[PDB]
A paper describes a structure:
NGO1945 from Neisseria gonorrhoeae FA 1090 is a protein of un­known function with a molecular weight of 28.6 kDa (residues 1–­248) and a calculated isoelectric point of 4.65. It contains an N-­terminal DUF2063 domain (residues 10–92) that has recently been classified as a new Pfam family, PF09836, which is currently comprised of 216 proteins from 173 species (170 from proteobacteria and one each from acidobacteria, bacteroidetes and planctomycetes). The crystal structure of a member of this family, NGO1945 from Neisseria gonorrhoeae, has been determined and reveals that the N-terminal DUF2063 domain is likely to be a DNA-binding domain. In conjunction with the rest of the protein, NGO1945 is likely to be involved in transcriptional regulation, which is consistent with genomic neighborhood analysis.
The crystal structure of NGO1945 was determined to 2.10 Å resolution using the MAD method. The final model includes one monomer (residues 31–230), two chloride ions, one imidazole molecule and 95 water molecules in the asymmetric unit. No electron density was observed for residues 1–30 and 231–248, even though LC-MS confirmed their presence in the purified protein before crystallization. Thus, they are either disordered in the crystal (note that there is sufficient space in the lattice to accommodate the disordered residues) or the protein may have undergone limited proteolysis in the crystallization drop. Analytical size-exclusion chromatography in combination with static light scattering (SEC/SLS) revealed the oligomeric form in solution to be a dimer, but with medium confidence (∼30% was clearly dimeric, ∼50% was interchanging between monomer and dimer and ∼20% was likely to be monomeric, suggesting that at any given time the dimer:monomer ratio was ∼60:40). An imidazole molecule (likely to be from the buffer) is bound on the surface to Glu114, Asp166 and Arg162, but its significance is known. The ordered region of the NGO1945 N-terminal domain (residues 31–116) includes the DUF2063 domain (Pfam PF09836; residues 31–92) and is similar to many proteins that contain α-helical bundles. An ∼20-residue loop (residues 117–137) connects the N-terminal domain to the remainder of the protein and could facilitate movement of the N-terminal and C-terminal domains with respect to each other. The surface-exposed aromatic residues Tyr34, Phe45, Trp62 and Phe80 in the monomer, which are mostly hidden in an N-terminal dimer, could play a role in base-stacking interactions with DNA if the functional form of the protein requires dissociation into monomers, but this is only speculation at this point. Structural similarity to transcription factors and presence of a surface-exposed basic patch in the N-terminal DUF2063 domain indicates the possibility of DNA binding.
Numbering used by the authors:
A (entry chain A), B (entry chain A): 31 to 230
The structure:
């Protein structure tokens, strides 16, 4: 066990502690070290790519397996790092009309947990949107069913507000006040950097 | 002007005061009486059907016209009476599976106002569902876009939960946790008497 192997094992421990700060609190000092000592001795920790360590530790933990509540909390935490690190294309600062197509940010993720990963692992169906906003801060928020559907559909094929609003016209009341509420929601997703212009 | 015409005019005044209790508070004693004296002298108040009086007073007011905020508040108030008075078919108390079709209650109404009719007539797009619940009490609640769409679609053609959930499968993530959240929402609409079995 050479000086290099000892260095990378210490960098593994340190990186895991940094990525899984909430999860770490559900364990004892000794329990947490045991988890890590096991990972480091496992084949998944032999990756030559340091970037792959947090994700391999999550898969190590899912194979043990840790409880379902801890596993959901670990996935949530990993997803935050995925949003922190996601590459979001440069967007020219010009005028984009409601005829211009949008796509969700590559730094935006839809998660479904059977536990309340935002609070204290309550058994309760939880639906969250994790993303990075215009100020480069990781944010999460509860996602309702309409929103989840739209983001998922939008992930399938870039969409303009005009196209969105026109498709829904047939499944909505004749009075078009909803189009104004919707545009408000859509505009808020642009400000928060949940959706970005789809630039070809 | 005979004793009968005087009796029905007093019953008109009294009925309007009862149906438009919130609206009445935005006016003075004299202002409110003037509105009513005008209605009573108008052709709309010559209806032989006493049930049609609250609705004819609303149309009288829309033709004057009263402000847009008062008119929205009047429509809201009238809608409550429509829910109070709606005839809801008798539903046998048997087992209805998620293969059984539902329809919205005939006592359930979808309203869109440019004013906050639930508070103090704020210029703000407001979307409400007004209905009568299992305890025969009139209820109202904010309606989000997914819900509005489903109720409107359901008003077009009776739908089962199995049919609903299967149609949405293609516009949702592969992980089916949302189906459990949805069933929860659907079950809550049955308890509150927003949707009722569609019995042929
Ligand atoms: Cl490494
Ligand atoms: Cl889960
Ligand atoms: Cl009458
Ligand atoms: Cl209005």
């Amino acid at each position: 066990l050479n000086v290099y192997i000892r260095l990378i094992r210490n960098n593994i421990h340190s990186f895991i502690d940094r990525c899984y700060t909430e999860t770490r609190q559900y364990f004892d000092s000794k329990e947490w070290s045991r988890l890590k000592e096991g990972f480091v001795r496992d084949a998944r920790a032999q990756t030559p790519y340091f970037q792959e360590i947090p994700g391999e530790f999550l898969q190590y933990c899912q194979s043990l397996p840790l409880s379902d509540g801890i596993l959901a909390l670990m996935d949530f935490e990993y997803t935050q790092l995925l949003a922190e690190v996601a590459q979001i294309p440069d967007i020219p600062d010009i005028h984009y009309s409601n005829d211009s197509k949008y796509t969700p940010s590559p730094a935006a993720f839809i998660r479904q947990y059977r536990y309340d990963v935002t609070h204290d692992l309550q058994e309760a169906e939880t639906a969250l949107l994790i993303w990075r906003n215009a100020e480069d801060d990781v944010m999460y928020q509860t996602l309702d069913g309409f929103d989840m559907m739209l983001l998922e559909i939008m992930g399938s094929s870039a969409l303009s507000f005009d196209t969105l609003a026109q498709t829904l016209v047939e499944f909505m009341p004749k009075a078009d006040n909803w189009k104004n509420i919707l545009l408000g929601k859509w505009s808020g997703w642009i400000e928060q950097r949940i959706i970005i212009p789809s630039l070809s």
